Each structure stands twice: as structure tokens, then as C-alpha cells.
């Protein structure tokens, strides 16, 4: 007979809830199969003779329903129906269950270790001898626990878990809780009974069967922080371990809540596909994201480790102790951890200077949000798997930004208290979006803020506001409007926000709050002010525009003192100035006059904003006909940066931000023939060539000295003979970019032709195309060899898109737009080409708008 699957919803019925799972997993890492018995204690809220749960790619051997114990213990068999399309299964009982009476489902199943790195999946690694060894691991977010064991796989059905793993003596098991006892079950078997967990969600259950070494430390709370990894690299886990300990202590103090587990394990999984996952008690990480080698694997690796560990541990409280009711609030989760990365490291590891990274992330978030193709942070997910791919990390970065704006509006300690009260009222339970806001509002400043209503305006609406300030005596007029950057058409939305404005004036040094809830509002000051500046600290997720002569007074403030406002404040001024120059509300003059202040600037964040906005203008001018203005603009840029370039040292000292800036400034100063830098680089290059590479060169200056070393054929042939032998990335790609900065077009065509046959060539085509002398060469070679090229690199990835867009991204003249369209017609290819043609048309537009102005501006000075 045929039985209709007794359920037609996407969510599980709400009236049958589990209490406690008893999981027995028995996996075989050489057969790549694993069988299991799971026991689920359940309670029915209503009478029903069917139980609906999740199971995916598991052949249910047999399932039974037990009730009671002792003389009353009863066991019935259960009929099993399977709805694979929905990843569901029904268990049909002969007589309906009794409301509130406890039952126990027992399911015997088996499956295959997943190759797809989802669920209970297999991973491999090679020891330092070539011996290939396997291990099994889990990745359940968002809904893959269905694959390791049947269950109510929704994050609001929290249960306890009693996990038991059958493994060989060779292996070693780890899970969320500590191992209580190991019992020899059979000849080659060993059962690891892990402690019973606290009430948690399914997708955070984790276990690992591996042959890992570990290194452990204990915090003041007695928590045992251990880092597991492969035996070869385990001497690379000291740093991550100390960071985990420090950050665990920080989080215990900040949340005023003890870490809710007895221990905490950071596992370095080989070829990890998700970067890291916050399994309660057993956080997993890509190898590169957790381990640190003496020979610097990267100048930014030792910071990625700290930010990763801070995020993953932040989730141990916010997210696992208190978890979202449904995936439609996952954004908040990823927001908080991401914001906590900033709050925590900023205190724990002050030497890393995480602030620059975080605020740059906010800049990128706004840049995306300002476009028509953007979505609000909070979106109703009807299926977690279908709409978990639609969500993008930029949404989560917004989330963190918004949360920072909020933390700064409300007192910092007010925010902290709201978090403490949120996590205490809701431990071991599930929360909605609005619950955090409600907890935020009930905090008293040591006017009610009504955080709920305000926050809804930022979460439920795409985009952010542009804020315009007009000052007539003591009357400060404020305007808000959806800042939409798309210049195509005139579509307008009535979006309004609750903007938590913050300002400072030339008189009072104190920060002033003002919550703009309407389109227009007026704020009265005690006395006239020399100048005023809104969005103090760059924390709020908006941009201000000063009407009348405000921009003048602020430009004068910067040029006169510039320390009057904070480093971030100056970075904000630059960013907003140019973004407003884009939407036609500020003269390009005003923006350049502003940038003039940059001769005194020492901090990295404003200098980088200024570079981000000034370099592309010069890059556009490179493809331009006349250089009589291009040279003048490059001269203006180097006059700007002359003091800052001189200030820098030729080492690898400082934070990631400072090293990156050092590299940029030195390579820039040397690529435009700055006497001091060119001569020093030639000196380093001579000494390097004398030893044939034996002499160590600072990795931050190697790009400058190699870019100068490829000038004359003498150094160029040397660098080519050197790159031939090298395979390392830092060793080879730096020399590659060096050889691509040559004033000898013969070497250029030689490199093109030879690299076509696989000498690398994907990036080489672009890095050669964006060369001032030979940029037409790279665009003309792609037309005659396009068929062979597309054949070699097929479709997808970034090769095709990086070399098609790279060769046509900085085109200034319309004569070249015709040459792009007449090419791509003769042939996600269409998407790449459409983006490229659109950006070229925008280039010609910006030229038409601003070139004649910039020329005149470059004269007055």
C-alpha cells in the first residue's frame, strides 16, 4: 500500500518536542561508512499517532517507540515513511501518543561519510613522509545534522545530547563535552562516552575522529583551552592557544557570565571549507586560519588568527547559549560576533590595530548598500538552505556596523549592560530579533531610547541615509534622504530612518547626541560655533553633507590644525567628501582642496581613504591622450605624500596596517621616479644581486626594489632568470609584477607570448595590461588570441573575468568604448562583459564631468 507522507509544511510540527538525544555513532574511516543508533526522548503537546523529524541520505534500518520502564516498559515498532525532497521522515505509531507523557524513539540507521564537506564528512592529510591518513569530522550548519543522525533539526528544538563514538585505538575522539570514560567494546573497538551537554541546538553538535596532537592551557575560570592539530604542525598552535585563553577571559568578564562549558577545543582541520565554525565546546578552523608558523606564513596571518578566534569564542555566549528562533535572524548572530571581534581584540591585542580593518569593512558595506541591487539585513527566510546562499557577508558587516553605531549612541556601558541582561534573561533559550532591542531599551543611563523602533528602520530597509546639515546662527537644520548612488534614472524611495546623530562643535569638546526620527528637524545650540562636525568617530552608518560653507570651515579646520578631530574623523571627512562629489553635491574642487590637508596626516586610515579616491583618477588619466595634466596630477599626489613617504622605515616593523601602508607608499614613490626612493631601492637591488638572492630583503620594500630592478635590461634579465627557478608565491609573484613594470616593450611582448603556453598567465595578462607604457598591447593580444584563451580557461572562476575586465577597466575615451562593443559582439560571459561596458561608459562620463575642472585646479595651487 501507499501511505501519504503525513505533513506538508517546511517547518516541523510544533507540538512534539525532544528533551534529550542519546547518540551512538560507529564510523569506519577506511570503509568510509558509519552506522548509528539514536535515542530521542520526546513529549507530545497534542494527541497524534505520527512523529515528523529530519533525515537526509540515511537508510533507516528500524525504528521503535518505547514508553515507561520497569514492569511497565512497553516497546512498539514504528512504520517509517520518507519524504526525501523535503529531507523529512515520519514515524507512524499504532495508537496515538499521550499528551505530556514521555516517550523514547529509537532509530537504527547507517550511511556513507560525506565527500561534500557537509554533515559527517571525510577529510585527508599527508604526513611529512607521504603517508596519507583520513579523519572524520562534522559541519552541521545550517541544517546538515540530518545527515549524521535523524533529529528535529531546527535551532529552536534545543535538547541535551549524550554522545558516544566508536573508534579504533589508533584514533582519538573529541566532541562538545569532555570525555567521561572509554570502554573497550570489541577486539579493535573503543567507545568514548562524552559527557552530557547542556540544552543546545542541533547544528552546534560536533565531533571529530582523528589522530591529532594537542596543546593545552587553563584560564582563571578553570576552563581548559586546548588546540588540536596534525602532529607535524602542532608546534604552530602556541599563538592561537594564548589568544584563545586571553579572549575567553575577556568574554567571561565582558558578558559577566562564566563560560558555560568545562573546556574549549580549537581544532585545525585540514582543507577546511568554511573557514571556521562555532561548535559549542569544539570550534573548528581552516588550518591557515588557526596555525601560525615561525617563517611568517603571511604578514596578515597572525591577525586573521586573532580575529577568527575572537569571533568563534564570541559565539560561545552570543549564539550558542542564546540562539536565534529561526534562520531569518542569523544576520544578528554574525553581526554581533563580527562586532565583538572589534571590541575584544581592541582590548586584548592592542598592537594589532584592528580598528582600521573594522572601519574599512564598514566603508565597503556602505559602498555596496548604496546601489539599487542591495537587500535589507533582515529578510524572512522560508527555507534555510535556499536563502542561506542568497545572504552575503556584506550583510553581516553591515550588522556589525549598525551595532557599533548603536553602542556609541547609547553609553558603551549601557550597551554592555543590555548585552548582559539579554544573555542572562535568555540563556539556554531562543530569541527573536526584537528581544535584543527590548533588552537594550530597559537599560538606564548611569529620555527613553526606544531602541526597538529605531533599529527596525535600519534592519528592515535596504540602504542607508545621507544627512545634510545647515547652520543658521544657533539653529542646526538636519535633513535625511535615502543615499542612492545609482545615477541611472530618477527612482526615489520614501525611506526614513531613526538616525542616532552625534556631533561636536568648536566650542564644547563633549559629544552631543540627537535622534532624528523625521525628514526634517532643528537642534538649537547655546552659542554660535566656529565649526561643527556630525557623525563623531565615524561610528554611525550614514554620511553627512554640510550645506552653505560648512565644508569650508571643516577644510580650514583640517588644514590649520587637523588634530582638532580624530584620525577616524578625518578619514570620514575625506570619504564623504568624495562620495558627495560623486552624487553631484560637492565640487571636485572642494574635494581636492580638502585633500590638500593630507600633507600633515600621519595616521593610516585617512591616508588610505585619500589614496583610494586619488589613485583611480590618475589611473584613468594614464589611458588618456595628453599627459600634460596627468604628470601634473602625479606631481600633486607625490607632493602630498612627500613627507609621509620620507617618514617611513625600510623594514617590516609595525602592525599589518602600517606594513601595508609602507609597501604602498614605497612602491608608489618608486614607480613615479621619486629620487630618494629610487636611489635607495637601486642600492638594495645592487646588494641583493651581488649575493644572488642570499641577502635578506624586507618583504615590504621588495616590490619597490624589484619594480626599479626591472627598469634596465641588466636587472630585468636577472629577475627573469630568478623567477624561472622560484615557485613560492611571495618569491614569484613579486618578481612577476616586477618584470611587468618595464619600459622595454620587447620584454613585454616576450613575456606575453611565453606565458600564453603556461610559463601564471591569467594574472600576468592583467598586471601587464595595467602598465603605463604597454596597456594597448595587452588589450590587442586578447582579441587575436581570444578563441584559444577561452578554450584554455573554459568558463567561471576569476581568470576569464579578471583578464577581460582587467584589460578594459580604466578606459577614458569613447573611441575605446566603441572598440569594446565592436569586439564582444563578434564573439557568466555576458554578465562580465555587461559590467565591463557599463564601467567604461561611467569612466567616459566621469572624464567628461571632471577633467576640464581638474586641469584648471592643477594650475592655481
Amino acid at each position: 500500500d501507499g501511505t501519504p507522507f503525513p505533513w506538508n509544511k517546511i517547518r516541523l510540527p510544533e507540538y512534539v518536542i525532544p528533551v534529550h538525544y542519546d547518540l551512538l555513532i560507529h564510523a569506519n574511516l577506511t570503509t568510509l561508512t558509519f552506522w548509528g543508533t539514536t535515542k530521542v526522548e520526546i513529549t507530545a503537546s497534542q494527541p497524534t499517532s505520527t512523529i515528523i523529524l529530519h533525515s537526509h541520505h540515511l537508510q533507516i534500518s528500524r525504528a521503535t517507540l518505547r514508553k515507561g520502564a520497569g514492569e511497565r516498559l512497553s516497546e512498539e515498532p514504528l512504520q517509517v515513511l520518507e519524504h526525501p525532497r523535503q529531507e523529512q521522515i515520519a514515524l507512524l505509531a499504532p495508537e496515538p501518543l499521550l499528551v505530556g507523557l514521555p516517550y523514547t524513539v529509537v532509530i537504527h540507521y547507517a550511511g556513507n561519510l560525506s565527500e561534500t564537506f557537509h554533515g559527517f564528512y571525510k577529510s585527508t592529510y599527508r604526513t611529512k613522509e607521504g603517508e596519507l591518513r583520513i579523519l572524520a569530522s562534522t559541519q552541521f550548519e545550517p541544517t546538515a545534522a540530518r545527515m549524521a543522525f535523524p533529529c528535529f533539526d531546527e535551532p529552536a528544538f534545543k535538547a541535551s545530547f549524550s554522545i558516544k563514538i566508536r573508534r579504533e585505538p589508533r584514533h582519538l575522539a573529541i566532541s562538545n563535552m569532555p570525555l567521561v570514560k572509554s570502554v573497550t567494546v570489541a577486539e579493535g573497538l573503543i567507545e568514548d562516552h562524552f559527557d552530557v551537554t547542556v540544552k543546545m541546538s542541533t547544528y552546534l553538535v560536533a565531533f571529530i575522529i582523528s589522530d591529532f596532537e594537542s596543546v593545552s592551557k587553563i584560564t582563571k575560570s578553570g576552563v581548559k583551552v586546548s588546540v588540536y592539530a596534525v602532529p607535524d604542525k602542532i608546534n604552530q598552535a602556541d599563538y592561537a592557544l594564548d589568544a584563545a585563553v586571553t579572549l575567553l577571559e575577556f568574554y567571561e568578564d565582558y558578558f559577566s557570565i562564566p563560560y558555560p562549558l568545562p573546556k574549549q577545543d580549537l581544532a585545525a582541520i585540514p582543507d577546511f571549507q568554511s573557514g571556521a565554525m562555532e561548535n559549542w565546546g569544539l570550534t573548528t578552523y581552516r588550518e591557515s586560519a588557526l596555525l601560525f608558523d615561525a617563517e611568517k606564513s603571511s604578514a596578515s596571518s597572525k591577525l586573521d588568527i586573532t580575529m577568527t578566534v575572537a569571533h568563534e569564542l564570541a559565539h560561545q555566549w552570543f549564539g550558542n547559549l542564546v540562539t536565534m528562533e529561526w534562520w531569518n535572524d542569523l544576520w544578528l548572530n554574525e553581526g554581533f560576533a563580527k562586532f565583538m571581534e572589534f571590541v575584544s581584540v581592541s582590548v586584548t591585542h592592542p598592537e594589532l590595530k584592528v580598528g582600521d580593518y573594522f572601519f574599512g569593512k564598514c566603508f565597503d558595506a556602505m559602498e555596496v548598500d548604496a546601489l539599487n541591487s542591495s537587500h535589507p539585513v533582515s529578510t524572512p527566510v522560508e527555507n534555510p538552505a535556499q536563502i542561506r546562499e542568497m545572504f552575503d557577508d556584506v550583510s553581516y558587516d553591515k550588522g556589525a556596523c549598525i551595532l557599533n553605531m548603536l553602542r556609541e549612541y547609547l553609553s558603551a556601558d549601557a550597551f554592555k549592560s543590555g548585552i548582559v541582561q539579554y544573555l542572562q534573561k535568555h540563556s539556554y533559550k531562543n530569541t527573536k530579533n526584537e528581544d535584543l532591542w527590548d533588552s537594550m531599551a530597559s537599560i538606564c543611563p548611569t529620555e527613553r531610547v526606544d531602541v526597538k523602533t529605531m533599529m527596525n528602520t535600519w534592519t528592515l530597509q535596504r540602504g542607508f541615509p545621507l544627512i545634510t546639515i545647515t547652520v543658521r546662527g544657533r539653529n542646526v537644520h538636519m535633513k535625511q534622504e535615502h543615499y542612492m548612488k545609482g545615477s541611472d534614472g530618477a527612482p526615489d524611495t520614501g525611506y526614513l530612518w531613526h538616525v542616532p546623530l552625534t556631533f561636536i562643535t568648536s566650542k564644547s569638546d563633549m559629544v552631543h547626541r540627537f535622534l532624528l526620527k523625521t525628514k526634517t528637524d532643528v537642534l538649537i545650540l547655546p552659542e554660535e560655533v566656529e565649526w561643527i562636525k556630525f557623525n563623531v568617530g565615524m561610528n554611525g552608518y550614514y554620511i553627512v553633507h554640510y550645506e552653505d560653507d560648512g565644508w569650508d570651515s571643516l577644510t580650514g579646520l583640517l588644514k590649520g590644525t587637523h588634530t582638532a578631530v580624530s584620525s577616524n574623523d578625518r578619514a570620514s571627512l575625506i570619504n564623504n567628501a568624495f562620495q558627495l562629489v560623486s552624487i553631484g553635491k560637492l565640487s571636485i574642487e572642494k574635494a581636492l582642496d580638502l585633500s590638500l590637508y593630507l600633507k600633515h596626516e600621519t595616521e593610516i586610515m585617512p591616508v588610505f581613504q585619500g589614496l583610494n579616491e586619488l589613485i583611480p583618477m590618475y589611473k584613468l588619466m594614464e589611458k588618456r591622450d595628453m599627459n600634460e595634466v596627468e604628470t601634473q596630477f602625479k606631481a600633486f599626489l607625490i607632493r602630498l605624500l612627500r613627507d609621509l613617504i620620507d617618514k617611513q622605515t625600510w623594514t617590516d616593523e609595525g602592525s599589518v596596517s602600517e606594513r601595508m601602508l609602507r609597501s604602498e607608499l614605497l612602491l608608489l614613490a618608486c614607480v613615479h621616479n621619486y629620487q630618494p626612493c629610487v636611489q635607495r631601492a637601486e642600492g638594495y637591488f645592487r646588494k641583493w644581486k651581488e649575493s644572488n638572492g642570499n641577502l635578506s630583503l624586507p618583504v615590504d620594500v621588495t616590490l619597490a626594489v624589484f619594480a626599479v630592478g626591472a627598469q634596465s635590461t641588466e636587472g630585468w634579465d636577472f629577475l627573469y632568470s630568478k623567477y624561472q627557478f622560484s615557485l613560492s608565491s611571495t618569491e614569484k609573484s613579486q618578481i612577476e609584477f616586477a618584470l611587468c613594470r618595464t619600459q622595454n616593450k620587447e620584454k613585454l611582448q616576450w613575456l606575453l607570448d611565453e606565458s600564453f603556453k603556461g610559463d601564471e598567465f591569467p594574472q600576468i595578462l592583467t598586471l601587464i595590461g595595467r602598465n603605463p607604457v604597454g596597456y594597448p598591447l595587452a588589450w590587442q593580444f586578447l582579441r587575436k588570441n581570444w578563441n584559444k584563451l577561452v578554450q584554455k580557461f573554459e568558463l567561471g572562476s576569476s581568470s576569464i573575468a579578471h583578464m577581460v575586465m582587467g584589460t578594459t577597466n580604466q578606459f577614458s575615451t569613447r573611441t575605446r568604448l566603441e572598440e569594446v562593443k565592436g569586439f564582444f559582439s563578434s564573439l557568466s560571459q555576458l554578465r562580465c562583459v555587461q559590467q565591463t561596458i557599463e564601467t567604461i561608459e561611467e569612466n567616459i562620463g566621469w572624464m567628461d564631468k571632471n577633467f576640464d575642472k581638474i586641469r584648471v585646479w592643477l594650475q592655481s595651487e
Partner: peptide, 4 residues
């Protein structure tokens, strides 16, 4: 995670 990705942070991002």
C-alpha cells in the same frame, strides 16, 4: 567565520 568568515568574519567575513
Amino acid at each position: 567565520x568568515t568574519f567575513p
